[PDB]
Amino acid sequence: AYDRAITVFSPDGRLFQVEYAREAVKKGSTALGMKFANGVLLISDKKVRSRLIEQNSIEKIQLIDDYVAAVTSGLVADARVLVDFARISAQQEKVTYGSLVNIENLVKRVADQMQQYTQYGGVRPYGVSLIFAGIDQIGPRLFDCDPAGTINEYKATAIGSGKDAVVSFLEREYKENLPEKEAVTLGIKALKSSLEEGEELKAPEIASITVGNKYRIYDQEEVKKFL
């Protein structure tokens, strides 16, 4: 009888509405990423859909800058609104400081925005989690921003329905400073071991950055190598 309002605690002291938004994240497809020797990558599973769909607009990975990029999972409407707010806050940060100096408070803008809606009545939170990654003045970065707003900087994570299995794999297999290719293949195996039996891993979008370089997205045939 308490999971009806965003502003009411349980007698345990839980926010079931916030947790249901976290559950709504869990219904989205798995997407992971990690940093390595001078840079970070991202991997995102896509169960291939209608060939009538222009492939340009089903990319879970999105470029928020030439030097910051991210990926979502959850409600598709809230997902797009969020990646928009990430872009706009990147622009405001870049204009008030001359450049995107640190990725961390771009993630802070997004985090405080997503946090605020977990506190006021008449508003529902965002049912999306976001994984930011890029290069700043410090170097390779990797965050995850959840519905409640909580951000944590990692060396590797996932989000989505697989997230537990992928972080379980990486938790016992990941070793830092891999040269880019080896890192990617480790992450591919991580993504593989999250599917259910019988499911064949289709072609996932993967993109990376190295220190001093911009992004690039591996096209489908560079992806096709690591199948």
Binding site: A24, K27, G28, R49, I58, L75, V76
Partner: protein
């Protein structure tokens, strides 16, 4: 594997089996109810235009026995065919959630209707305990007939009794139980046609308790 067992149940009892039962009720069951009703009508007046003595307490009215037997066989067949539809609906009750129960409530409503049909098809004596609708006889019609008749036959044969009201009570047992038969057939016609209506309007939600296209919203 669990999904194999669930699929094994659903492939065993499917919608075409249920709908074949519905077609059978839609044609044959109804004219059979009507024929037994007309036989009850005729036997009622046959008893009515008579005056009894000791001799009628010595032989059972085999015509009435046949009418009761036909009604009993009809109620058995109707109850089994109803249990078929019960099983078809019950093996597709989905995972119990606290939301999403729109189609689930349709299944509960249709099962509730079939419950009424089978509680008034299954037999019951005059229980004298229920404040609701007393059930017209059901399965145990020939049983209740022979019991209530045999009591009066014992009292009349023994020396025997001298009450003329006892003899007229035997006559009233005969006419009254045929009357109960024709009442019960009319009510069964009503309830069967109601169930046919409910199934043929709700079968899509009965087979699919909820539709899932979450990939449109969740990706």
């Amino acid at each position: 594997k669990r999904a194999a067992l669930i699929q094994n149940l659903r492939d065993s009892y499917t919608e075409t089996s249920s709908f074949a039962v519905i077609e059978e009720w839609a044609a044959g069951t109804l004219q059979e109810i009507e024929g037994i009703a007309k036989a009850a009508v005729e036997a009622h007046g046959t008893i009515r235009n008579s005056t009894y003595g000791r001799a009628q307490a010595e032989k059972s009215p085999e015509q009435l026995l046949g009418v009761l037997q036909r009604y009993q066989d009809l109620c058995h067949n109707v109850y089994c065919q109803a249990e078929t539809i019960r099983t078809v609906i019950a093996i597709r009750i989905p995972e119990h959630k606290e939301a999403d129960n729109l189609g689930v409530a349709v299944q509960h409503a249709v099962l509730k209707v079939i419950d009424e049909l089978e509680i008034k098809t299954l037999g019951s004596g005059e229980k004298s305990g229920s404040g609701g609708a007393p059930t017209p006889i059901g399965m145990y019609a020939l049983r209740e007939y022979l019991s209530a008749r045999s009591t009066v036959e014992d009292k009349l044969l023994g020396g025997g009794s001298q009450s003329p009201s006892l003899l007229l009570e035997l006559r009233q047992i005969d006419a009254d139980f045929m009357l109960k038969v024709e009442l019960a057939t009319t009510h069964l016609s009503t309830m069967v046609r109601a169930v046919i209506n409910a199934y043929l309007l709700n079968w899509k939600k009965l087979i699919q308790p909820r539709g899932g296209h979450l990939d449109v919203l969740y990706r």
